[PDB]
């Protein structure tokens, strides 16, 4: 049985994260999204896995993977969903959307035994987004109607094609979903351990994962669940609160407080800062005194521009989404929902009250 | 013996605190000002206590007070005089101003034995405010001069009276004052021209809570005199504690916190990790103090939260306030002169070299807010992130630059 | 053998430090620069030491030094040449530039035995600044070329001379230089045309303190070489200490403090609670470092205080300074190019990728002040709360936006 993972989108809705990485390598704890997919396919025995990507997303993927077939897309644009065609298979195949996270693999294992065409569906609370599966009287696919303002049922297209899905399901469309899955993963996929190094006068409570070569210095105080990734350097006198995820080689410093945030590879928050309910991408540097607001005065849900459309995040508390290789000056101030583009620089003292462009030098 | 507490001012001079509570419920440690009064009256045996309030806030008082008589004032005319006109007594009564804090009750106990009209006087360093008692050659009340500028003595009206039904006569005689009010003090002045009106000098600690920095004053004094080192709450390891520290029940204090007394930590409060409470920090109830937050000589009222990266010095923060991360208060002027505060539109020295801010109830500050010395921020205000607050801020104001 | 220390420059290049002290009293750890000089002279036995200063600051030097000879410079004519014209010596003398720090004294000891004119030279990486010594075929002084651009060798003038009375002759011969000064180097250049003038190469550590970041340079070196882990002070529990840490007497260090050496904590200082001193923190004397304050690679001079919520990196803060809560120093530029500093009105690279600020004596910053890399702030300045300091700030300036 062949299998295909459909990347090749350009996750615009997941900017600024996707300015610098394909959505396939969105980190969930230590591992990129696509690795979970490959991993769970192999638990069904699949072995021959191909990823449909776009040049010049073309690898990248090659650098990152890893004994797997990388094949590009061509060449009009639409689908659905692609194209599709760039995949070469005779007989059957397993097609899986490359922006899915799913917990168990059991329904994929089950679906590949069948010789009829079959697809997986999943129940959700918000079927008015996603494509709803309408079934006939013998529970086969009548049609997939999409955006149906008037949703016939709660059963939607789970995006695995060759059955109702059981476990945890999430597509990573908008940036705050990066928080969603990472919270879930920290709750479900990993367990209290310490392969790193912790000094005296460090308080630790609840589920705390400390990976190898991670240093945690005196005065630090950790309230779980927390994930501290390999090579990270915490403290002295840091404070990590529940659902802090530091994916790899992160610097958290004196008088710095993190909460319910995903902070990606190599990013550093060295002094006098509070990061709440945020996603900070790779190789970011916060200047001393950089602060993120995560609550609006009226306590209404924080809104975010996603493809130029102003949209509720469904979160009462949401911070910022910082792109890769951003540097903030000292005493920077960032407002709720704000997106800051990859490679931006925020001039000292700035109050960031609007989205900031790729490469922008935002100085007042 | 009946007793009346006069509590139907709108304490304008105590704004912003009084935007959201009657001055009678200004917290001194865990207890409201009026409760100390009722408490100390009962130590004299008084039992029948009535509070003259203004409808509305009639009702408030009803919610808060339990088996004490709540009676409103007549809505036409204002004044302490107008207040007892709504008071029904009898023969004698004990009248006490509802903005007073006094330590011992001994002179009230003493004064209520006499059957002459008598009032209590008290020596202060600034008699040019308050009403000065001028006495005759036999130490009875000649007259009460209001804010004399040329003060005959230091002995001023302590605002505890024992008075007979005759005052109601003199209350009709006298008419409205310069500020549009029916001053009881005028009535007493006629009464002393005369009944013989006896003037008992007060011994202990005395303070009226007129201006907002007096909230700090009494609370320091209470922490120094009325309570003693204890811990009914929970303290983690690596918490340093020095001096007088009171930790009330259900109060959590987390590792890294460092406390230099005297400090009062009220019930339900959550301190740390890595907080720093310095001398005369008063957290009245259910306060959140967080990582890299430092408090000093400040009264922080019910339910207010300072969760990150802030310094609060020499300030009064009222109830259900929220400081955004990085909110700072300045408490010293560049020239080190005494910090000035606008009180009823008048710019006035606080007598303090170090004074921070007075924040009203339900204020929220954004992150990286910066507040200057002496500033008043009105109840329900919102300060925009990054704002520099260099002027008083209105009730409800969205101050955004 | 007489000796003269030349200390009558303006040290303009070392502003703002020199607004309030002569360069001779730039602190290197606990001791002023000149004391190291005197100290190391005496290790050669010299005993009769004179310092050529500028009246006033005559001044000063008298208050700080006895009984070392203090002698002013004369006639509204400047220069090292003008300096020794005020120096009175028959026969020989040792002349040493009063802005030098040198580790060993061995070459001075050696040079004073000779009876020829001799000077010390020293190899450096940047000989295009400084005066290069060109030697003849028998290693005596051919000439000193000033800032050659095409540097013949790496061997430059170390600014220690042994000279005979003959120099006074050559001092009258030569006349004013391009920059309006009487250069002693010109006199020595004539003298070498010739007396035979011997050039001894210097061995150890050598540094002139011309620009403000050199204060950091020597202080790092001193902390690495001249002092060793000890604790004559007091340290509370939950204080972490790593690496070389010097704690002088009457210094208090409170719980939560975390120290990563090498660090020097001068006498009388008060650290913590929850402070964080990182490598090459030098607190020279009586310094206050407070909660949620972090210092790094910085020299912080007598009596200065950083009490709350601040980060000082790669900076020099002079005496009796006060940083308001939330005062931050930026030490890195966005492009990571070397930080530039105005030095005598010329914009100049510091050679440092990471450089913070140079704060003059008696400066006060308001809360939430924000200071940019390379910035100089003049003595006695005041920075208004919330200000972003993005330019040099004047002596006495009230910088408010
Ligand atoms: O109409 C009134 C006026 C005053 N009082 C009561 O008399 C006592 C002393 O009355 P004050 O004369 O101090 O009036 P005030 O408290 O409203 O002062 P401002 O800050 O508004 O200037 C206070 O406890 C007050 O409640 C009344 O009961 N009714
Ligand atoms: O007129 C002078 C000038 C300089 N000197 C002293 O001789 C040595 C050589 O001084 P330099 O002539 O090399 O310059 P400078 O160090 O004075 O530079 P500024 O930072 O002051 O601009 C220095 O230690 C200085 O103090 C004098 O004695 N007299």
Short mmCIF file of N, CA and C in Angstrom, two decimals, chain C residues 110-195:
data_model
loop_
_atom_site.label_atom_id
_atom_site.label_comp_id
_atom_site.label_asym_id
_atom_site.label_seq_id
_atom_site.Cartn_x
_atom_site.Cartn_y
_atom_site.Cartn_z
N UNK C 110 64.15 48.56 36.05
CA UNK C 110 65.30 48.39 35.17
C UNK C 110 65.75 49.71 34.51
N UNK C 111 64.80 50.52 34.06
CA UNK C 111 65.12 51.68 33.24
C UNK C 111 65.80 52.79 34.05
N UNK C 112 65.59 52.79 35.36
CA UNK C 112 66.11 53.89 36.18
C UNK C 112 67.57 53.67 36.58
N UNK C 113 68.08 52.47 36.34
CA UNK C 113 69.50 52.17 36.57
C UNK C 113 70.37 52.83 35.50
N UNK C 114 69.88 52.83 34.26
CA UNK C 114 70.62 53.40 33.14
C UNK C 114 70.87 54.89 33.37
N UNK C 115 71.91 55.42 32.73
CA UNK C 115 72.20 56.86 32.81
C UNK C 115 72.08 57.55 31.46
N UNK C 116 71.91 56.76 30.40
CA UNK C 116 71.43 57.30 29.12
C UNK C 116 69.94 57.65 29.22
N UNK C 117 69.48 58.55 28.36
CA UNK C 117 68.05 58.70 28.09
C UNK C 117 67.46 57.40 27.56
N UNK C 118 66.39 56.94 28.18
CA UNK C 118 65.72 55.72 27.74
C UNK C 118 64.22 55.83 27.88
N UNK C 119 63.51 55.15 26.99
CA UNK C 119 62.06 55.13 27.01
C UNK C 119 61.58 53.70 26.85
N UNK C 120 60.37 53.44 27.32
CA UNK C 120 59.77 52.12 27.14
C UNK C 120 58.83 52.11 25.94
N UNK C 121 58.92 51.03 25.17
CA UNK C 121 57.99 50.78 24.06
C UNK C 121 57.20 49.51 24.28
N UNK C 122 56.09 49.37 23.58
CA UNK C 122 55.15 48.27 23.85
C UNK C 122 54.46 47.87 22.57
N UNK C 123 54.32 46.57 22.35
CA UNK C 123 53.68 46.07 21.14
C UNK C 123 52.16 46.04 21.31
N UNK C 124 51.45 46.51 20.30
CA UNK C 124 49.99 46.53 20.31
C UNK C 124 49.44 46.07 18.96
N UNK C 125 48.16 45.72 18.93
CA UNK C 125 47.51 45.27 17.70
C UNK C 125 47.11 46.44 16.80
N UNK C 126 47.02 47.64 17.37
CA UNK C 126 46.52 48.80 16.65
C UNK C 126 47.50 49.98 16.74
N UNK C 127 48.67 49.85 16.09
CA UNK C 127 49.72 50.86 16.20
C UNK C 127 49.45 52.12 15.37
N UNK C 128 48.42 52.08 14.54
CA UNK C 128 48.07 53.23 13.70
C UNK C 128 47.50 54.37 14.55
N UNK C 129 46.87 54.04 15.68
CA UNK C 129 46.75 54.99 16.79
C UNK C 129 48.04 54.89 17.59
N UNK C 130 48.24 55.81 18.54
CA UNK C 130 49.49 55.86 19.30
C UNK C 130 50.69 56.25 18.42
N UNK C 131 51.77 56.65 19.08
CA UNK C 131 53.01 56.98 18.39
C UNK C 131 53.94 55.79 18.24
N UNK C 132 54.21 55.41 16.99
CA UNK C 132 55.11 54.29 16.70
C UNK C 132 56.58 54.66 16.89
N UNK C 133 57.31 53.81 17.60
CA UNK C 133 58.77 53.90 17.68
C UNK C 133 59.43 53.22 16.47
N UNK C 134 60.11 54.02 15.64
CA UNK C 134 61.04 53.48 14.65
C UNK C 134 62.44 53.45 15.25
N UNK C 135 63.10 52.31 15.13
CA UNK C 135 64.42 52.11 15.71
C UNK C 135 65.50 52.15 14.63
N UNK C 136 66.73 52.44 15.03
CA UNK C 136 67.86 52.33 14.12
C UNK C 136 68.46 50.92 14.19
N UNK C 137 69.58 50.72 13.51
CA UNK C 137 70.21 49.41 13.41
C UNK C 137 70.82 48.88 14.72
N UNK C 138 70.89 49.73 15.75
CA UNK C 138 71.41 49.33 17.06
C UNK C 138 70.33 49.43 18.14
N UNK C 139 69.06 49.35 17.71
CA UNK C 139 67.90 49.53 18.59
C UNK C 139 67.98 50.69 19.59
N UNK C 140 68.22 51.89 19.07
CA UNK C 140 67.93 53.12 19.79
C UNK C 140 66.88 53.93 19.03
N UNK C 141 66.37 54.97 19.67
CA UNK C 141 65.26 55.71 19.10
C UNK C 141 65.76 56.48 17.88
N UNK C 142 65.35 56.03 16.70
CA UNK C 142 65.41 56.89 15.52
C UNK C 142 64.43 58.05 15.71
N UNK C 143 63.14 57.77 15.60
CA UNK C 143 62.12 58.79 15.85
C UNK C 143 60.81 58.16 16.34
N UNK C 144 59.94 58.98 16.91
CA UNK C 144 58.55 58.61 17.16
C UNK C 144 57.64 59.23 16.10
N UNK C 145 57.04 58.40 15.26
CA UNK C 145 56.02 58.88 14.32
C UNK C 145 54.65 58.85 14.98
N UNK C 146 53.94 59.97 14.94
CA UNK C 146 52.56 60.02 15.44
C UNK C 146 51.54 59.47 14.42
N UNK C 147 50.70 58.54 14.88
CA UNK C 147 49.61 57.97 14.08
C UNK C 147 49.92 57.86 12.58
N UNK C 148 50.80 56.91 12.22
CA UNK C 148 51.42 56.92 10.90
C UNK C 148 50.56 56.50 9.71
N UNK C 149 49.49 55.74 9.94
CA UNK C 149 48.67 55.20 8.84
C UNK C 149 49.38 54.09 8.06
N UNK C 150 50.69 54.25 7.87
CA UNK C 150 51.53 53.21 7.27
C UNK C 150 52.55 52.74 8.30
N UNK C 151 52.10 51.94 9.28
CA UNK C 151 52.89 51.73 10.49
C UNK C 151 54.10 50.82 10.24
N UNK C 152 55.32 51.36 10.42
CA UNK C 152 56.55 50.59 10.21
C UNK C 152 56.63 49.30 11.03
N UNK C 153 56.18 49.36 12.28
CA UNK C 153 56.14 48.18 13.14
C UNK C 153 54.99 48.28 14.14
N UNK C 154 54.88 47.28 15.01
CA UNK C 154 53.83 47.22 16.02
C UNK C 154 54.29 47.82 17.35
N UNK C 155 55.55 48.25 17.40
CA UNK C 155 56.15 48.75 18.63
C UNK C 155 55.86 50.24 18.82
N UNK C 156 55.06 50.58 19.83
CA UNK C 156 54.61 51.96 20.05
C UNK C 156 55.13 52.53 21.37
N UNK C 157 54.97 53.83 21.54
CA UNK C 157 55.43 54.53 22.75
C UNK C 157 54.57 54.22 23.97
N UNK C 158 55.16 53.54 24.95
CA UNK C 158 54.42 53.10 26.13
C UNK C 158 54.18 54.21 27.15
N UNK C 159 54.84 55.35 26.96
CA UNK C 159 54.56 56.53 27.76
C UNK C 159 55.25 56.52 29.12
N UNK C 160 56.22 55.62 29.30
CA UNK C 160 57.18 55.73 30.39
C UNK C 160 58.55 56.16 29.86
N UNK C 161 59.02 57.32 30.32
CA UNK C 161 60.32 57.88 29.91
C UNK C 161 61.27 58.00 31.10
N UNK C 162 62.55 57.73 30.86
CA UNK C 162 63.63 58.22 31.72
C UNK C 162 64.46 59.26 30.96
N UNK C 163 64.50 60.48 31.47
CA UNK C 163 65.03 61.60 30.71
C UNK C 163 65.93 62.49 31.56
N UNK C 164 66.96 63.05 30.92
CA UNK C 164 67.90 63.96 31.57
C UNK C 164 67.51 65.41 31.35
N UNK C 165 68.18 66.33 32.04
CA UNK C 165 67.78 67.73 32.01
C UNK C 165 67.88 68.30 30.60
N UNK C 166 68.46 67.53 29.68
CA UNK C 166 68.71 68.01 28.33
C UNK C 166 67.40 68.23 27.60
N UNK C 167 66.34 67.57 28.06
CA UNK C 167 65.06 67.63 27.38
C UNK C 167 64.52 69.05 27.45
N UNK C 168 64.83 69.76 28.53
CA UNK C 168 64.37 71.14 28.68
C UNK C 168 64.93 72.04 27.59
N UNK C 169 66.16 71.74 27.16
CA UNK C 169 66.76 72.42 26.02
C UNK C 169 65.92 72.17 24.78
N UNK C 170 65.66 70.90 24.50
CA UNK C 170 64.93 70.53 23.27
C UNK C 170 63.47 70.99 23.31
N UNK C 171 62.93 71.13 24.52
CA UNK C 171 61.56 71.63 24.69
C UNK C 171 61.42 73.08 24.21
N UNK C 172 62.47 73.88 24.40
CA UNK C 172 62.48 75.27 23.92
C UNK C 172 62.71 75.34 22.42
N UNK C 173 63.51 74.43 21.89
CA UNK C 173 63.75 74.34 20.46
C UNK C 173 62.43 74.19 19.71
N UNK C 174 61.66 73.16 20.05
CA UNK C 174 60.48 72.79 19.27
C UNK C 174 59.31 73.71 19.61
N UNK C 175 58.41 73.89 18.64
CA UNK C 175 57.28 74.79 18.80
C UNK C 175 55.95 74.07 18.56
N UNK C 176 54.85 74.82 18.63
CA UNK C 176 53.50 74.25 18.81
C UNK C 176 53.10 73.32 17.66
N UNK C 177 52.41 72.24 18.00
CA UNK C 177 52.03 71.22 17.03
C UNK C 177 50.71 71.57 16.32
N UNK C 178 50.29 70.70 15.40
CA UNK C 178 49.08 70.90 14.61
C UNK C 178 47.82 71.10 15.46
N UNK C 179 47.79 70.48 16.64
CA UNK C 179 46.61 70.54 17.51
C UNK C 179 46.78 71.55 18.66
N UNK C 180 47.74 72.47 18.53
CA UNK C 180 47.86 73.61 19.44
C UNK C 180 48.52 73.25 20.76
N UNK C 181 49.40 72.26 20.73
CA UNK C 181 49.98 71.70 21.95
C UNK C 181 51.51 71.65 21.86
N UNK C 182 52.15 71.60 23.02
CA UNK C 182 53.60 71.43 23.12
C UNK C 182 53.92 69.95 23.39
N UNK C 183 54.10 69.18 22.33
CA UNK C 183 54.32 67.74 22.42
C UNK C 183 55.69 67.38 22.97
N UNK C 184 55.73 66.72 24.13
CA UNK C 184 56.98 66.16 24.66
C UNK C 184 57.61 65.17 23.68
N UNK C 185 56.77 64.44 22.95
CA UNK C 185 57.27 63.51 21.94
C UNK C 185 58.16 64.19 20.88
N UNK C 186 57.89 65.46 20.57
CA UNK C 186 58.70 66.21 19.62
C UNK C 186 60.06 66.50 20.22
N UNK C 187 60.06 66.86 21.50
CA UNK C 187 61.29 67.12 22.23
C UNK C 187 62.17 65.87 22.23
N UNK C 188 61.57 64.73 22.57
CA UNK C 188 62.32 63.47 22.60
C UNK C 188 62.85 63.14 21.21
N UNK C 189 62.10 63.52 20.18
CA UNK C 189 62.51 63.27 18.79
C UNK C 189 63.76 64.05 18.40
N UNK C 190 63.85 65.29 18.86
CA UNK C 190 65.07 66.08 18.68
C UNK C 190 66.22 65.50 19.49
N UNK C 191 65.97 65.25 20.77
CA UNK C 191 66.97 64.64 21.65
C UNK C 191 67.61 63.40 21.03
N UNK C 192 66.86 62.65 20.23
CA UNK C 192 67.34 61.39 19.67
C UNK C 192 68.12 61.58 18.36
N UNK C 193 68.43 62.83 18.01
CA UNK C 193 69.10 63.18 16.74
C UNK C 193 70.54 63.74 16.82
N UNK C 194 71.24 63.68 17.95
CA UNK C 194 71.03 62.65 18.94
C UNK C 194 71.91 62.81 20.18
N UNK C 195 71.30 62.55 21.33
CA UNK C 195 71.78 61.53 22.25
C UNK C 195 71.36 60.13 21.74
#
